[PDB]
Amino acid sequence: SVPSQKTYQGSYGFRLGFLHSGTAKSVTCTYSPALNKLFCQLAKTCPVQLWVDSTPPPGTRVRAMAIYKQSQHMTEVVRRCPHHERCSDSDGLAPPQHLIRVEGNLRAEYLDDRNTFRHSVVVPCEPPEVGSDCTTIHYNYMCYSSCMGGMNRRPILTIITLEDSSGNLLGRDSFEVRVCACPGRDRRTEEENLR
Numbered sequence: 001s002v003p004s005q006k007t008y009q010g011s012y013g014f015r016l017g018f019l020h021s022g023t024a025k026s027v028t029c030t031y032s033p034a035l036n037k038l039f040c041q042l043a044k045t046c047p048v049q050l051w052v053d054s055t056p057p058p059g060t061r062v063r064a065m066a067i068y069k070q071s072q073h074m075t076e077v078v079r080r081c082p083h084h085e086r087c088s089d090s091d092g093l094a095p096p097q098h099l100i101r102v103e104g105n106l107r108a109e110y111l112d113d114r115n116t117f118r119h120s121v122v123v124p125c126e127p128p129e130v131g132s133d134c135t136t137i138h139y140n141y142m143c144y145s146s147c148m149g150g151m152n153r154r155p156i157l158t159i160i161t162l163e164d165s166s167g168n169l170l171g172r173d174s175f176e177v178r179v180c181a182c183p184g185r186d187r188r189t190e191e192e193n194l195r
């Protein structure tokens with residue numbers, strides 16, 4: 001089966017936000033609003049903001065999952081390639097097969113779905129710190145889009161879901177991701193191509 005990617009703000013007005021990082025050749029993570037696409041280097045911090053109109057209940061969680069973007073591949077589980085799943089770069093919490101990790105959250109939980117076999121990582125939501133109006137989650141992508149025997153140059157989407165304590169849907173958003181050596185250049189190129 002294939003997880004839904006339908007944008008759904010839900011009762012709390014859930015949506016993502018991204019920093020404005022620019023397209024300098026030295027940039028490690030940059031987001032294109034025109035393409036709804038994140039470009040990032042391997043295993044580098046990707047800040048993603050979580051916005052709501054009103055505070056959800058205690059016990060609310062936020063889950064990230066990757067799927068292939070192209071319909072002929074959507075049924076295939078997105079996983080790390082045969083090289084990176086064996087390179088012993090574990091943080092002690094993420095299974096070595098998972099593409100997406102959460103950085104710096106000891107309450108992160110990693111799921112291997114007993115039925116779909118798809119991978120995801122989920123963390124508890126906490127309301128914003130004093131003075132701030134949103135929260136930020138830091139993601140890492142642990143394979144290149146180009147990795148042979150893995151994503152193999154196929155585009156992926158990240159689906160972010162806001163869930164209640166049972167895992168029921170409260171909200172959903174998504175963005176395309178390219179994990180690459182030069183995010184600044186590739187963003188500039190793809191935005192030019194779109195023009």
Ligand SMILES: O=C(Nc1cc(Cl)ccc1O)C1CCNCC1
Pocket residue numbers: 050051052053054055056060125126127128133134135
């Ligand atoms: O509660 C809020 N945000 C928020 C809460 C949680 Cl649990 C997770 C991510 C968030 O962005 C704002 C606080 C200011 N008034 C509107 C609601």
Ligand SMILES: [Zn+2]
Pocket residue numbers: 080081082083084142143144147150
């Ligand atoms: Zn790889």
